[PDB]
Design a protein around this ligand. Structure first.
Ligand SMILES: CCCCCCCCCCC(=O)OC[C@H](COP(=O)(O)OC[C@H](O)COP(=O)(O)OC[C@@H](COC(=O)CC)OC(=O)CCC)OC(=O)CCCCCCCC
Ligand SMILES: CCCCCCCCCCCCCCCCCC(=O)OC[C@H](COP(=O)(O)OCCN)OC(=O)CCCCCCCCCCCCC
Ligand code: HEM
Ligand code: HEM
Ligand code: HEM
Ligand code: HEM
Ligand SMILES: COc1c(O)c(C)c(C/C=C(\C)CC/C=C(\C)CC/C=C(\C)CC/C=C(\C)CC/C=C(\C)CCC=C(C)C)c(O)c1OC
Ligand SMILES: CCCCCCCCCCCCCCC(=O)OCCCOP(=O)(O)OC[C@@H](O)COP(=O)(O)OCCCOC(C)=O
Ligand SMILES: Cc1cccc(-n2nnn(C)c2=O)c1COc1ccn(-c2ccc(Cl)cc2)n1
Ligand code: FES
Lengths: 126, 248, 54, 385, 123, 93, 93, 55, 50
């Protein structure tokens, strides 16, 4: 549990620097291909642990057609693992389909929870 | 540490009770008790072994009754309260040569010879260590070693200095069945007899282990078959997804 | 096959035939192993040494 | 409804081993908790039947174990199953704890389940120590002397704890008679903590090797995982029977067949194989009070693990760098056991000091640093800015 | 606490009594080795005391052997000076009991024996 | 009895996942299938595919800790031999 | 978890009795009352009222079993004295 | 008996069984309290108690 | 003997009462039996051997 606000703060500083982007981004591409979740037909946002109130808020606000597609990818990955196989190569998730569909719902639920903490522990300045 | 402080490593001889389907050689246990009584028993006790456990293993019931009746044991006291003595019976234990350990050290220049009832299980090496010790006394120590007076050299003992001299020499025992009693023959017979004294269950344990391994390896193969039958509906299950219409 | 259709005819065995055949199994299994074990070690047992002193 | 659901006692059986919803994709590593319940039953049953023939006096303890091996009918089966069954109890427990390290089972919402399991591990180490001293061999006397003298370094209450633990001035007759009575009791405290362990498991269920939710695809316990449990039960009994009947003294020391003597020191004093990594941590600190704290902190450092894992993904299945450093921690634990069975010599003293550092730096330095690096690599490998 | 008298000690021995479950080494000290005990320099040792602070006894000699190594035990007076050559790691030392020859840097606790009117109580 | 705190698992009928719509599943009875048709190709081809994917995460840490133990064992054997006697006196001070 | 069989007790709010309507109750705090005002009249008058209502169900069975034991004890003492020696021989056959 | 009369094996096995049965009684007391919890206690009037309860 | 001190006699009195009886000692260096007078940790002896 780091934060998704802290991950985006460090990651945006790397991608805007011209010399840090040429050195860290090819390492991150080989790290994802060696992980192997796309061979089970999954995206990265399916992998996030969900037993926390921030993540339960973001899953309620997801549109209905994307919640049906997410539930099918999770069920298909549980059946593929118990048979100890991988999916056929025409059903692997491509690189241009691995998009962060759930990240904008996470970042707005976290900014509202931080604003509620700063107002409940505020000091008057008379 | 130094290799002299560890002791020399004992090699691996081909004992006839090595192997999962092998028993003791009971003609070598009988020959090994005779080397115990005539050679070892002058200084060693065998305190965990009763007379009755020898019947049906190396001697008959009539033979052990005559061996036990050559020793004297304490009886219940008299009607006046005076002590008494009696000969031995089958429920007695084999007696030792010394009354206490102060008298044992006085006859052996301060050293105490141990009890030999568990000596095979209590040494690293097992039967191979006891055989290599009794046949591994050199005629002279190597050049440079200074022995204290009253010690002997044996390279299998840790430190190389032992308080037991060489005891086994050729034709010091006349065997009953006619086997030639050399040094290596008599050293092989005591080690088989002393392994029976430490593990008298050995022949029965290896026969109950044959029944247990056959039954448990048949239950293991039958349970793999039954598990693959009951899981066959889950393993070949298929899923299809048609995305719902956006009415909702 | 069909020899597991002659004795049982599509059913399971039963709980009483399991307990009845288990006791018949114990006496035949114990005799067959004691015979193989003593034949493999012939000449070393006490009943072979006891004969050779007589 | 059915009678197994409405009866007060049968509903507890139905809700735990019959109708319990399990994740579909759990593998054979999830079968180790069932084997640990079988191990605890074997130890309690074989120990009660041996306790009918045992005498705990200082001049009768060694000879009553020899009386069990020679005079009691099938008494050698009772002892060898008991002595080898304790080594099998520790081997399955090491594999059960390492499964939770690899798959992230310590994480929330299963923190209370992890904390109760740490208490079970401490009580099992104490049980095996107390029963080993009841043989009163030569290894039993000098192993109890080394451990009880460690508590004399505590300031201002050192000499009062050790004299109250002995019942006298050394390891004597009151020490062995009280060690046997405490050995009968602590297995019943372990059985009460196992019930509290299963109550915390019931409210959230098990995890799965993918690290994601399992509420979408469940199968019941009866006839899938009842018959998958039978496969590892019959393999456990077959390997244990090969040790009990064909090699019953491989996992022991030959010096424990010598009766214990307070006036003769053995050449080497070494524990059993499952206490050897914690014995090498103790001998690596030159101070006497700091060694006792460090040996007990090697168990309590498992409690800090829910807080130093900084990852947003549960488990090691899709993590490259977390998989590499998991097996560094595993083979470092085997090297600590090999060092603890050697003499205090060059270069084994420096090798045991570096390996003690790598044990503690895994929980406190390595895991929080590489969890943060993997969070950022997952981000910048997808987002295009 | 065991109670022994003056001339009731085993004089020409090294008796290892199991007083309080502890090995302990006892020797009759003849008054001729005050010339001979401390001819050894204690700078060849690692920490010096005196004969006086160690042995407060003129003609008797006691020291216990709950050793900080693991609890070893020596062999009686052969070896180098009349001391005690030990077979565990090759240690041997002086007639009084202070180690430097062999790897043992410290020295042992002396028992708190006590004299009161033709008596000595080891304890 | 009273209710307790909230959980993340339920029971049969109210297990607690998202709503499902559009997925259909098919199965076939185990009595209608041929017995043990994975005793050959799964044991040779599939187990080789699972082995070589995960063998560099285990054997590179295993080779580091085995090289370290083997040089420390061979150096201790040299120190207590006859040729290593003047090195033993200077690494013991 | 699943539910279990039906009971006859509930919990707070749904205990399981009939519906109540028309009953009102009143109480007063224990801090506003005088302490121990039943130490005299309850101990003498009320405990005497509870005693004598239930004392014939206990003392009529107690007097039957005490009369029976007392005659059997006095007859055994007569049989083993000197005067009861010819009765002892005929009740022992 | 473990023999032909009350002897040494009789007393050594009676003490080991005496240590164990109090722990079986403690497990039956827990099963006793589980059956009490589903219906509650009775009262000295013999009628229902669901109308007037105190914690 | 030690339980009588402070109840009916002094420490000096019980030491003289215990030293009028003979007890078994540890054996000699040759292994022969020995005797010794009594001390405070001994028990009060009886008149018959069995
Ligand atoms: C102290 C003694 C205890 C004895 C009992 C403990 C036994 C359990 C060993 C630990 C373990 O659980 O590892 C299992 C793991 C494989 O788990 P998986 O679900 O991914 O593979 C399912 C399989 O493909 C289909 O398994 P399937 O159901 O098709 O066949 C069953 C299989 C029996 O398997 C077992 O019983 C467990 C070993 O039958 C056969 O193998 C046929 C040949 C006779 O294996 C591995 O991942 C690596 C193998 C070596 C690991 C050993 C590490 C120990 C230090
Ligand atoms: C107090 C702290 C105590 C801690 C105890 C630490 C010591 C534990 C000793 C047992 C270690 C065994 C590790 C058990 C962990 C199990 C989880 C695991 O590692 O997963 C198996 C691993 C990866 O599994 P995947 O899910 O990714 O896919 C598998 C497809 N074949 O797939 C594999 O790579 C196979 C695993 C093989 C592991 C072999 C290495 C262990 C060797 C131990 C030798 C010890 C005796 C000398
Ligand atoms: C065939 C005859 C004998 C056998 C098999 C035998 C066996 C043994 C064994 C196994 C040991 C222990 C070795 C060890 O601890 O590593 C031993 C030690 C000893 N034996 Fe014997 N023994 C025999 C005859 C004798 C005899 C005749 C004597 C006569 C004095 C004797 C005196 C001793 C002594 C003093 C020791 C102690 C040695 C030491 O601790 O250094 N033994 N014997
Ligand atoms: C979690 C459960 C237990 C564990 C891990 C355990 C462990 C051990 C161990 C390691 C030994 C030494 C074995 C040897 O080397 O010979 C031992 C000995 C012994 N144990 Fe246990 N024990 C357990 C339960 C019990 C119980 C419940 C009892 C008694 C009711 C018991 C009775 C004994 C006895 C009598 C010995 C005597 C020595 C022997 O017979 O080997 N054990 N125990
Ligand atoms: C000694 C007796 C023990 C018993 C009888 C026992 C029993 C069980 C059982 C039956 C399970 C569920 C099945 C499984 O996941 O394998 C389980 C899970 C678990 N146990 Fe244990 N266990 C014991 C010791 C321990 C220890 C020593 C630890 C940790 C230090 C531990 C921690 C856990 C955890 C975290 C889980 C959940 C794993 C998951 O759901 O993925 N347990 N235990
Ligand atoms: C160690 C033994 C026992 C313990 C700890 C125990 C404990 C309890 C407790 C705490 C209650 C709660 C209500 C009350 O106090 O009346 C209770 C009720 C009850 N017990 Fe026991 N008990 C024991 C033995 C027995 C025995 C020997 C019997 C009958 C043969 C019995 C039958 C009952 C019954 C019928 C009730 C319900 C009474 C009512 O609700 O009116 N119990 N018990
Ligand atoms: C996730 O999946 C699982 C799961 O897979 C399993 C298996 C279980 C099942 C749980 C276990 C296997 C662990 C339970 C084990 C215990 C509670 C151990 C307790 C042990 C005892 C109570 C031993 C008691 C033994 C005795 C009293 C011995 C009796 C001996 C006697 C009477 C000798 C005297 C005899 C005579 C003739 C005088 C789960 O609960 C579970 O969670 C849902
Ligand atoms: C058609 C059906 C056929 C199916 C056949 C399958 C049979 C297979 C049996 C063997 C398989 C596994 C072996 C293990 C076993 O049988 O365990 C017994 C039950 C498991 O434990 P539990 O009692 O369910 O949990 C027990 C615990 O989890 C529950 O904690 P508790 O304390 O009881 O809670 C109530 C607290 C009350 O406390 C008070 C104060 O009153
Ligand atoms: C030193 C030595 C030598 C010989 C045998 C044994 N020993 N004792 N029992 N067994 C099975 C043995 O092998 C030992 C003890 O070794 C260790 C190591 C850590 N502990 C320990 C830690 C926590 C607690 Cl609470 C209790 C003990 N004990
Ligand atoms: S005893 Fe300390 S070095 Fe020999």
């Amino acid at each position: 549990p780091q934060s998704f606000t802290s991950i985006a703060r460090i990651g945006d500083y790397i991608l805007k620097s011209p010399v840090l982007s040429k050195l860290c981004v090819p390492v991150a591409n080989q790290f994802i291909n060696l992980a192997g979740y796309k061979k089970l037909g999954l995206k990265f946002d399916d992998l996030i642990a969900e037993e926390n109130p921030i993540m339960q808020t973001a899953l309620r606000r997801l549109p209905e057609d994307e919640s049906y597609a997410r539930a099918y990818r999770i069920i298909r990955a549980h059946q593929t693992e118990l048979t100890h196989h991988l999916l056929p190569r025409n059903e692997w998730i491509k690189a241009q389909e691995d998009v962060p569909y759930l990240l904008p719902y996470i970042l707005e639920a976290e900014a509202a929870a931080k604003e509620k903490d700063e107002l409940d522990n505020i000091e008057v300045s008379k | 540490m130094t290799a002299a402080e560890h002791g020399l490593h004992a090699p691996a001889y081909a004992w006839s009770h090595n192997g999962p389907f092998e028993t003791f050689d009971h003609a070598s246990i009988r020959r090994g008790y005779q080397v115990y009584r005539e050679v070892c028993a002058a200084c060693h006790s065998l305190d965990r072994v009763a007379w009755r456990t020898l019947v049906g293993v190396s001697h008959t019931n009539e033979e052990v009754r005559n061996m036990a009746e050559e020793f004297e044991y304490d009886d219940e006291p008299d009607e006046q309260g005076n002590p008494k003595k009696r000969p031995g019976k089958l429920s007695d234990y084999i007696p030792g040569p010394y009354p206490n350990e102060q008298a044992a050290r006085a006859a052996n220049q301060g050293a105490l010879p141990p009890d030999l009832s568990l000596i095979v299980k209590a040494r690293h090496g097992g039967c191979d260590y006891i055989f290599s010790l009794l046949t591994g006394y050199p005629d002279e120590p190597p050049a440079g070693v200074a022995l204290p007076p009253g010690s002997n050299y044996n390279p299998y003992f840790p430190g190389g200095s032992i308080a037991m001299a060489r005891v086994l020499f050729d034709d010091m025992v006349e065997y009953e069945d006619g086997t030639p009693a050399t040094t290596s023959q008599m050293a092989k017979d005591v080690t088989t007899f002393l392994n029976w004294c430490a593990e008298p269950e050995h022949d029965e344990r290896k026969r109950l282990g044959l029944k247990t391994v056959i039954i448990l390896s048949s239950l293991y193969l039958l349970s793999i078959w039954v598990k693959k039958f009951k899981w066959a509906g889950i393993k070949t299950r298929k899923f299809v997804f048609n995305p719902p219409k956006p009415r909702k | 096959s069909s020899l597991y259709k002659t004795f049982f005819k599509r059913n399971a065995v039963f709980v009483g035939t399991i307990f009845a055949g288990a006791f018949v199994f114990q006496t035949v299994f114990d005799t067959a192993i004691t015979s193989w074990y003593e034949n493999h070690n012939k000449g070393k047992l006490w009943k072979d040494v006891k004969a050779r002193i007589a | 409804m059915a009678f197994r659901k409405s009866n007060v006692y049968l509903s507890l059986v139905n809700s735990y081993i019959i109708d319990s919803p399990q994740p579909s994709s759990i593998n054979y590593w999830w079968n180790m908790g069932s084997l640990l319940g079988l191990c605890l039953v074997i130890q309690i049953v074989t120990g009660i039947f041996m306790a009918m023939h045992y005498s705990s006096n200082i001049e009768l303890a060694f000879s009553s174990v020899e009386h069990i091996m020679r005079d009691v009918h099938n008494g050698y089966i009772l002892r060898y199953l008991h002595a080898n069954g304790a080594s099998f109890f520790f081997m399955v427990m090491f594999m059960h704890m390492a499964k939770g390290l690899y798959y992230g089972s310590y994480r929330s919402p299963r923190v209370t389940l992890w904390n109760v399991g740490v208490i079970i591990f401490i009580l099992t180490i104490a049980t095996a120590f107390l029963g080993y001293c009841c043989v009163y061999g030569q290894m039993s006397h000098w192993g109890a002397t080394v451990i009880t003298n460690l508590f004399s370094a505590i300031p201002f209450v050192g000499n009062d704890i050790v004299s109250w633990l002995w019942g006298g001035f050394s390891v004597s007759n009151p020490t062995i008679q009280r060690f046997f009575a405490l050995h009968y009791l602590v297995p019943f405290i372990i059985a009460a903590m196992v019930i509290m362990h299963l109550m915390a498991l019931h409210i959230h269920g098990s995890s799965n090797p993918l690290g994601i939710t399992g509420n979408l695809d469940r199968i019941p316990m009866h006839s899938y995982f009842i018959f998958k449990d039978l496969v590892t039960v019959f393999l456990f009994m077959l390997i244990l029977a090969l040790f009990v009947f064909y090699s019953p003294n491989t996992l022991g020391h030959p010096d424990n067949y010598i009766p214990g003597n307070p006036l003769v020191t053995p050449a080497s004093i070494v524990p059993e194989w499952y206490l050897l990594p914690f014995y090498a941590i103790l001998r690596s600190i030159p101070d006497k009070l700091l060694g006792v704290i460090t040996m007990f902190a090697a168990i309590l450092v498992l409690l800090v693990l829910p807080f130093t894992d900084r990852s947003v993904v549960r488990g090691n299945t899709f993590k490259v760098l977390s998989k590499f450093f998991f097996f560094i921690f595993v083979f470092n634990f085997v090297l600590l056991g090999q060092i603890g069975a050697c003499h205090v010599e060059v270069p084994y003293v420096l090798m045991g000091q570096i390996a003690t550092f790598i044990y503690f730096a895994y929980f406190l330095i390595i895991v929080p640093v590489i969890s943060t690096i993997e969070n950022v690599l997952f981000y910048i490998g997808r987002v295009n800015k | 606490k065991v109670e022994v008298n003056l001339a009731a000690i085993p004089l020409g021995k090294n008796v290892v009594v199991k007083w309080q479950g502890k090995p302990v080494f006892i020797r009759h000290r003849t008054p001729h080795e005050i010339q001979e005990a401390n001819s050894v320099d204690m700078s060849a040792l690692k920490d010096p005391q005196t004969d006086a602070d160690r042995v407060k006894d003129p003609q008797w000699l006691i020291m216990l052997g709950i050793c900080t190594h693991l609890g070893c035990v020596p062999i009686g007076e052969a070896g180098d000076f009349g001391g005690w050559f030990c077979p565990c790691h090759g240690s041997h030392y002086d007639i009084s009991g202070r180690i430097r020859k062999g790897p043992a840097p410290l020295n042992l606790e002396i028992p708190a024996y006590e004299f009161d009117g033709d008596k000595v109580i080891v304890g | 009895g009273p209710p307790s705190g909230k959980t993340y698992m339920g029971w049969w009928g109210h297990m607690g996942g998202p709503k499902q719509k559009g997925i259909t599943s098919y199965a076939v009875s185990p009595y209608a299938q041929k017995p043990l048709q994975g005793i050959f190709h799964n044991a040779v081809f599939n187990s080789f595919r699972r082995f070589k994917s995960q063998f560099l995460y285990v054997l590179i840490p295993a080779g580091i800790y085995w090289y370290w133990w083997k040089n420390g064992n061979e150096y201790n054997e040299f120190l207590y031999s006859k040729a290593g006697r003047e090195e033993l006196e200077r690494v013991n001070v």
